[PDB]
Amino acid sequence: PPTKPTKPGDNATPEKLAKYQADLAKYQKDLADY
């Protein structure tokens, strides 16, 4: 599998959440292929 990011639970601030979302752009891309 590709680089899977950590889930924003307690750190689910709009800041880190955006980082997560931006990283999903990379993750979910390879993940969809996988």
Residue 2 CA to residue 9 CA, distance in Å, equals 21
Experimental method: NMR
Q: How far is residue 1's CA from residue 17's CA, in Å, rounded to a whole number?
A: 21
Nearest CA-CA partner of 5 in 34, 14, 25: 25
Is residue 20 helix, strand or coil?
Answer: helix
Cβ-proximal residues to 6 (8 Å cutoff; 6+ apart), any chain: 20
